[PDB]
């Protein structure tokens, strides 16, 4: 229970689910739900459940046909359901029938029910490695890779009535981030935050902030080295970022052909970066990318990813935020 302490929680047993990367992790109640991913040989569409209170793994109860095995998809929790969107579908080993997706599946937590939201009308282009979050009773998906180029569009869909809902493209304003994919997204205060990612020639360590009300982006002027402030984290892709107590925590990812395991923290109010010093009794997680993160109570949870030598991981780590 030591504060600011990494703790190596029990990994996902081999008979429960395969060690994976490019998966999605969502927090609900006192459990973490892992969906999709890449075990090193094939795509996945199982649903795992890590009970945080007693650290017990199990296959989550699922009825109905789940989404096609995929990775680089997004998952968000709205109300009592989890919403899967997008991703990369096909057969990895034989390199055939590969396509990005723009479908929408709902997983009802109380019943384990998989329902596909067959949305009518104009849909957002099928994409992978997009950003996604839930805000104001709507699913927001942003950027990604569509097959030919990176994206910088943004779409919303109301999650209130499956039959009475459709997609709407957001007329974004402000400094729209450069076309990006493989980046984490966190909502804090009433703003959505995006840090770095894979953006081609425009790959940087800029921090972007999207205020939902006026739908405007702002690249927070950071590295105020005039103030001697600690520098921003190195530019990276495949990293995770979570929000907790007016702070953003960035971990992992591939940064200039390395896998740093430093824990970076961004004070949203004071616009300052810092490296969180883990306690002496901490079990430091190894550098990884394409892992996944969620927050339960005052602790962050890291699952899976790809460590050095292209090795898939089933490890689960917990960092005590406070």
């Amino acid at each position: 229970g030591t504060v600011h302490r990494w703790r190596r929680l029990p990994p996902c047993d081999e008979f429960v689910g395969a060690r994976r990367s490019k998966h999605t992790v969502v927090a609900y109640k006192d459990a973490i739900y892992v969906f999709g991913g890449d075990n090193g040989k094939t795509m996945l569409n199982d649903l795992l459940r890590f009970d945080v209170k007693d650290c017990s793994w199990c296959r989550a109860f699922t009825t109905g046909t789940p989404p096609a095995p995929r990775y680089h998809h997004s998952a968000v929790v709205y109300g009592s359901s989890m919403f899967v969107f997008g991703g990369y579908t096909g057969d990895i080993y034989s390199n055939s029938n590969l396509k990005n997706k723009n479908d929408l599946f709902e997983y009802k937590f109380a019943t384990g029910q998989w329902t596909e939201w067959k949305i009518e009308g104009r849909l957002p282009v099928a994409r992978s490695a997009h950003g996604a979050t839930v805000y104001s009773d709507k699913l927001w998906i942003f950027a990604g890779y569509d097959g030919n180029a990176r994206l910088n569009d943004m779409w919303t869909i109301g999650l209130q009535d499956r039959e009475l809902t459709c997609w709407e493209e957001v007329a974004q304003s402000g400094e729209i981030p450069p076309s990006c994919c493989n980046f984490p997204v966190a909502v804090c205060r009433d703003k959505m935050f995006v840090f770095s990612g894979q953006s081609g020639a425009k790959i940087t360590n800029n921090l972007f902030q999207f205020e939902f009300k006026d739908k405007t982006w702002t690249r927070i002027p950071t590295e105020h080295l005039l103030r001697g402030s600690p520098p921003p984290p190195q530019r990276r892709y495949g990293h995770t970022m979570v929000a907790f107590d007016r702070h953003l925590y960035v971990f992992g990812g591939a940064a200039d052909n390395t896998l740093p395991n430093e824990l970076h923290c961004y004070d949203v109010d004071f616009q300052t970066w810092e490296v969180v010093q883990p306690s002496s009794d901490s079990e430091l997680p190894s550098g990884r990318l394409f892992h996944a993160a969620a927050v339960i109570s005052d602790a962050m949870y890291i699952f899976g990813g790809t460590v050095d030598n292209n090795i898939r991981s089933g490890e689960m780590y917990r960092f005590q935020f406070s």
Binding site: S21, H72, S94, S96, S128, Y145, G200, A254, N257, L259
Partner: protein, 170 residues
């Protein structure tokens, strides 16, 4: 109805993938391009009196593939395996890149061309022509010596020949 050829430039860090791509597309030698930047280029060029769209991706980084890198590596029509004649390690890794393409493509053979770059650096050359030519005939793929430093050598031919290899299959 114009044909599009997705070409991928792969190789060790520093062999000159960015230099070659920028030389081929922008007709300028750019020294010390950002080693981590990985982006794509587009032109409309006429090869053997036949117009074609060229979609080239300058690869970077050895960690897991970004969503863009992966889909390019899986759907690419041809690959340029590039090593530096001044970096013996890059030459020993030609085999590693060769196996990577076939493993991804799940094929016994795929359109590829071995590219020996930085040939202009003669005094510091480490890998000879017979060494590279043997490596190419070992993998049953063509061999081209290139230099992206002004004046460029076989930069246009290297990419064009890869297209020609693609056209003369199946």
């Amino acid at each position: 109805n114009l044909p599009t050829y997705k070409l991928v430039v792969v190789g060790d860090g520093g062999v000159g993938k960015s230099a070659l791509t920028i030389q081929f597309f922008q007709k300028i030698f750019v020294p010390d391009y950002d080693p981590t930047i990985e982006d794509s280029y587009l032109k409309h060029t006429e090869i053997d009196n036949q117009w074609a769209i060229l979609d080239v991706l300058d690869t970077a980084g050895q960690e897991e593939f970004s969503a863009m890198r992966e889909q390019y590596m899986r759907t690419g029509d041809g690959f340029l395996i590039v090593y530096s004649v001044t970096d013996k390690a890059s030459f020993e890794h030609v085999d590693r890149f060769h196996q990577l393409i076939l493993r991804v493509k799940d094929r016994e053979s795929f359109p590829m061309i071995l590219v020996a770059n930085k040939v202009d650096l003669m005094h510091l050359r480490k890998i000879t022509r017979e060494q590279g030519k043997e490596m190419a005939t070992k993998h049953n793929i063509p061999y081209i010596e290139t230099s992206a430093k002004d004046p460029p050598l076989n930069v246009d031919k290297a990419f064009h020949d890869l297209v020609r290899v693609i056209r003369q299959q199946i």
